[PDB]
Design a binder for these strands. Sequence first.
DNA 1: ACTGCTAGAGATTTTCCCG
DNA 2: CGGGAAAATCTCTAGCA
DNA 3: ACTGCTAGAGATTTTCCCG
DNA 4: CGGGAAAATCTCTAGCA
Lengths: 47, 47, 261, 237, 261, 237, 66, 66
Amino acid sequence: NFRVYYRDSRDPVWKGPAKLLWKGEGAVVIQDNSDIKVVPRRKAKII
Amino acid sequence: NFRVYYRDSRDPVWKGPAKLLWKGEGAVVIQDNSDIKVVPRRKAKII
Amino acid sequence: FLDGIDKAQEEHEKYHSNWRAMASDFNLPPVVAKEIVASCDKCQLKGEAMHGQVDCSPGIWQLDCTHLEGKVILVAVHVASGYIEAEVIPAETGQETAYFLLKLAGRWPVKTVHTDNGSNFTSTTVKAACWWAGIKQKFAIPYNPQSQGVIESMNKELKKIIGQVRDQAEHLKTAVQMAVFIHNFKRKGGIGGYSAGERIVDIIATDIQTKELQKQITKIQNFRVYYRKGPAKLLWKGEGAVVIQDNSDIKVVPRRKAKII
Amino acid sequence: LDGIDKAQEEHEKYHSNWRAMASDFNLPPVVAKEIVASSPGIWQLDCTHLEGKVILVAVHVASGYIEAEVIPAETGQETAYFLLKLAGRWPVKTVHTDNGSNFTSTTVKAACWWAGIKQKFGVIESMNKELKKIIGQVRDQAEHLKTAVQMAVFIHNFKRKGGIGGYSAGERIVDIIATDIQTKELQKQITKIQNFRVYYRWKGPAKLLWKGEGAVVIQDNSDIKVVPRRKAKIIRD
Amino acid sequence: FLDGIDKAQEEHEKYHSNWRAMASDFNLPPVVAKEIVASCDKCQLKGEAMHGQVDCSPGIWQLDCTHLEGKVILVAVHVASGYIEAEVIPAETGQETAYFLLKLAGRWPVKTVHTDNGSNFTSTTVKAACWWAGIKQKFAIPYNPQSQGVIESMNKELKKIIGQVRDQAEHLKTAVQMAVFIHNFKRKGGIGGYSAGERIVDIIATDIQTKELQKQITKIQNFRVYYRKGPAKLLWKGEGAVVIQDNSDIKVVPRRKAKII
Amino acid sequence: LDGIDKAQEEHEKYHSNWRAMASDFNLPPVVAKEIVASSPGIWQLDCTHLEGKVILVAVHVASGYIEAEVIPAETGQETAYFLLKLAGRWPVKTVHTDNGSNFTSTTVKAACWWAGIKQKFGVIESMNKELKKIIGQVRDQAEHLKTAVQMAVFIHNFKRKGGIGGYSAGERIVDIIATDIQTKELQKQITKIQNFRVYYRWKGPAKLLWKGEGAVVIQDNSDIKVVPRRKAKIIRD
Amino acid sequence: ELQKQITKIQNFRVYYRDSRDPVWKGPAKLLWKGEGAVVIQDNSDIKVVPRRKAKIIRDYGKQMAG
Amino acid sequence: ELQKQITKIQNFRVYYRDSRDPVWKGPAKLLWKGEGAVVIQDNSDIKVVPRRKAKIIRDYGKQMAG
DNA sequence: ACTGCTAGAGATTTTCCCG
DNA sequence: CGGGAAAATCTCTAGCA
DNA sequence: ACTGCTAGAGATTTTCCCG
DNA sequence: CGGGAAAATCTCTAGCA
Ligand SMILES: C[C@@H]1CCO[C@H]2Cn3cc(C(=O)NCc4ccc(F)cc4F)c(=O)c(O)c3C(=O)N12
Ligand SMILES: C[C@@H]1CCO[C@H]2Cn3cc(C(=O)NCc4ccc(F)cc4F)c(=O)c(O)c3C(=O)N12
Ligand SMILES: [Mg+2]
Ligand SMILES: [Mg+2]
Ligand SMILES: [Mg+2]
Ligand SMILES: [Mg+2]
Ligand SMILES: [Zn+2]
Ligand SMILES: [Zn+2]
């Protein structure tokens, strides 16, 4: 399991921890409170 | 002698040719129609 | 360290000091200071320092809108080649964009378009067009213009040319076509020293020719390879190396420990 | 380098062009061109009418590849604009028109002068007939006419396959333009080297053909001779 | 080439093709195509791809204003060390800024301040302050925030900290001081693994000590060097190399062809 | 490494501290500390009055370096704010106050708890007198009082030089804080190594002191012995 | 027959990238082409490359300068 | 006397930059310090550096470790 | 005649520790 | 002299607005 | 489950040409 | 095999808004 912290969409405030559901080269798919998002890896931190 | 073409100050339009009066590392001093300016070398082209 | 750790958690809870500071002041192994910082939710404020890479398959186009002198310019780029099609439109609507896209798909092979999430690109009528032309639609991550770096840089370039040739037209649509012409045929560089028109011709022709040649080779060169396994389908033998495809998985194995049948 | 004599014999026996020679005998194309020496940019422009609207069609003669858009008025401005568009999408060297009023306007002439196109005042009519057939076939799938016109241009350029190879007009135009790019590249190389004179072994001046990594192919007295690089001197005249 | 050049100037005058395109199409030496592009005023649209480097002398400070939650935060950074002084102010005025600057100059050795051209920094009262404190004023090139990259990055950093500790204060001025404290003493890294407070102490102390030591050395070690010239003042002999200062010009010469008197 | 015995003799003869030893005999400071073993963060805080305004002065005891600002009200909030400012500009470990109402507020206590300062309820008064003297000397050069106060803080910290060396209070505070940083660095090193035990030549456990590039200095039975690195084994206890 | 075809397939140049390097690697030789992957050969090194990362040309200015 | 002073002056570390390289070069030894220029020695190479480009520390944590 | 920088995240290379 | 792990270094990004 | 890029300017290294 | 000059490659930036 991983914890993800991310900047989503124009909001300059980091959120998390979310579950990592999928990691590709360039972007990750996370689950933050039953709300699936797609975040560029420039805008995430996986721990 | 050199010809200088430069982007001055928030104006996105390149001007010139001006005379180069002085070249330092990082910036140049030019004369465009008796009007001396100081331009960063990121914003000039000397020929 | 049990004493030094607790004095470190208490101080981070107040100052959010970085791992170097808590290693220097509480005498901690850098791994332990890092584990302290890594469990503070308030300190996760930074992402990776990389970039992804955009798809550059031969059939992918990036579309975007751009604005100039009050008008809307719809632009497409062929990603592999740098070849553009632009056109001044009446308004950023799905109707107009679906029209532009039908034209493009009839003039070139378009398999996939990639756009941001502007309302014109996401409209239900651009979707009906793409479904008729057999186009796959790929939408970026919202508010990530880097997902379309190719078309976005092409806006830079198109706008740059239009400014060089603006005094030769009266209307903007004329200058937009002048700039599309100048970019596609009068600017040379990149891979192969080409212009974008020559390069798209080369890319598309190469795709057709390689498809045909490989189809023939596979029709003729029919073999099965056992290496180290199952009857892996042979792909290429040469130079003492063998490339096979075992269960839709491509791998390079040296000629040793690999028999061809 | 060794196949030069085989190439000469094959060409004297079968009159084969430089491509088949430089392909079967593995020769640089300038040499095969020398042996064999020892359309692509043509479009037809015509306006058609249908449901009271003007459709301005362009056909690439060599391939049958179609560019058609509904235009608002059969005026010189709309035709000059259509022509700039076409010239920016494809390499267009010469247009064949029919001396109509719009095709002879000063506007279209200035467009052609800017885009470097040459104006010259039967395939276009058969292509109009095929276009009208497909438009009638797909009219029930669009509301407006311009949409059905583009649907038909699509079906013609990519979903109709005919001719010898079984290709479509888009495949054909790409093959033709590719071959044409090759032709200009070869001619550019020939023009680049044809100002050099080589003295080998010293013998009289020779027309230089190639400057490989291990040899220097030349042509003297209507005959092609291979010499090693160090045995000859290349100067520019 | 006289024919191919004129066909190239005529075509550039219409399309502004790049030098590669005019070399490929008119058979031109790349130097000649480049000379064609280089004489078109309309094609000079791009500057060098470098950056300058900001002054980092021990006595230079970069000041800027920044805004948060509706308030104005004046910030200073010591360039050599990364040490900050911030303070919430009533309004971006020259009076307030001159006050902040008198305080800074009384708390630290400030020889030179570097600012952008905001009206508060250019006011006649900040100038009277700097004249009383013996400060030299350096104004950036207008609209070039890169001239102040240090203070501008410090805004990033200060704002980042204030957001971590904002829930521990009620007012903003409190959180600004909390962040100045955390940055100056609770974050470690850079040159010497230091924090910014330790690093400014080290920089200033090193400056004083080296000034003193070199003053003594030059008072004692008094010699003149003839190399290859005039009696160049000796600076440092050692390891077979000699460094001298001939007419306010410092140069490294090997011990050979250099006699010390 | 060789000067260890010379250092021991010098210390038995003159009782010299570890700095003068590690400076004259070229020793790593942990070794000189072992031989010699064989204030900086103190501020005084007091409020003064002048032209009906409150001036809140802080003095660094060791150096005489002054931080003074005119404050609006002699309240606990203004003092807590002044104290956060000071603690963010300098390393402040302990403040000496005078049990006044503002210095004893819950606000100042929370400020000190956040900034890790210790509160303890004569130099401050002499410094107030000197500050008032300079303020009276420079009052005609400013309109407001806060400006003249900062002018005086400047003159005192940088333009008044006294004492033995002829330094000013800013030079002194920088020297003192530098030496203090050195002290914490040395203590940090000592704390880092004092959990290791060395077995050399095997002999009993030894207190490790240094781990250079070509030797390993230790201390056994209140005596310091240098051994080559390969001749001893270092373990952590 | 077949060896002609193979020698033809190996005349196409490939430009490509690795998943964390932004610069395009210079021309390699194409050995095999599939739907998803392209097998190349860059300096006697047989890499596999995903299709989305490979630009396969022929370079006509090269086919014709020899 | 003098050689003590010189050995002291050579204990200060210098971080510096060249006029077109953004990264700070690691610690060099200080040999001489003037108003405008600092003379250093980085890997047996005696460079001259303008003052505005040199960060002269002493590193106290290193000093107190040998 | 002036000038992008800083700090964190991850990847990659060096160093050190015991054999 | 050999690996393994940890330290050190290097590479690269956002935000400064 | 997706993803910065492109073209020009200058600097630096390779290649080629005649010895 | 040696330099010199030209070609080729590499490094890095703004603007895309
Ligand atoms: C309403 C639609 C849909 C949702 O988002 C907005 C806003 N937006 C913003 C930019 C922009 O910020 N370009 C500057 C830039 C910065 C970095 C980079 F890598 C590339 C870049 F182009 C666009 O280009 C763009 O097309 C849009 C747009 O279309 N929309
Ligand atoms: C009215 C004063 C005087 C004249 O100019 C304006 C406007 N301005 C604009 C930025 C800004 O664009 N920051 C983003 C950024 C971008 C790149 C980079 F390298 C550094 C950066 F900080 C400032 O920071 C800033 O202080 C000002 C300001 O003060 N003024
Ligand atoms: Mg958009
Ligand atoms: Mg865009
Ligand atoms: Mg500002
Ligand atoms: Mg700013
Ligand atoms: Zn934290
Ligand atoms: Zn031009």
